[PDB]
Design a binder for this molecule. Structure first.
Ligand code: HEM
Length: 152
């Protein structure tokens, strides 16, 4: 639904992220667990992490964070043509994990916040606008996909 130029802005940031997938990954997750602790319960496995440092220190978490961004990155470089990629994600989050759409709104926030913190000079209004939109297209697609699975 985005213009060619918005894609480029999106992808232009994405390239910075990609220079430190793991580091972004951790800030991203950690912010989420921090701004909305409830999301933390969906992780049977990270739920025992009581502090920031402890989160910062977890190999597992960090690993998990590369996984999330890898997948996310894969969709974004499809510039809207991402059915293939999107489908498998929706099935499990809908089926296995049960992540409500609100939860996606939360991670979406966490994303934009980390990028803005790390990449100011590359993350202005238009570029921040472009990323938002991108995150909305993904979330929209995901939601339809959820219903079709009989989730929401
Ligand atoms: C950008 C949005 C998201 C993307 C790209 C994403 C991506 C992934 C990927 C690629 C996996 C690996 C295998 C799987 O599909 O089960 C995963 C697993 C998982 N995701 Fe997400 N995720 C996102 C958002 C979330 C959110 C917001 C939550 C909960 C608040 C969540 C909960 C989980 C959990 C619990 C698992 C399995 C963890 C494990 O391996 O133990 N996901 N996610």
């Amino acid at each position: 639904v985005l213009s060619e130029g918005e894609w480029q802005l999106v992808l232009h940031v994405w390239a910075k992220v990609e220079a430190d997938v793991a580091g972004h990954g951790q800030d991203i997750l950690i912010r989420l667990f921090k701004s909305h602790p409830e999301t933390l319960e969906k992780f049977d496995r990270f739920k025992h992490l009581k502090t920031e440092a402890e989160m910062k220190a977890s190999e597992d978490l960090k690993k998990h964070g590369v996984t999330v961004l890898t997948a996310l990155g894969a969709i974004l470089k499809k510039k809207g043509h991402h059915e293939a990629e999107l489908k498998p994600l929706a099935q499990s989050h809908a089926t296995k994990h049960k992540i409500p759409i609100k939860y996606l709104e939360f991670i979406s926030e966490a994303i934009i916040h980390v990028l803005h913190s790390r990449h100011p000079g590359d993350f202005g209004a238009d570029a921040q606008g472009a990323m938002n939109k991108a995150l909305e297209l993904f979330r929209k697609d995901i939601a339809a996909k959820y219903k079709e699975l009989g989730y929401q």
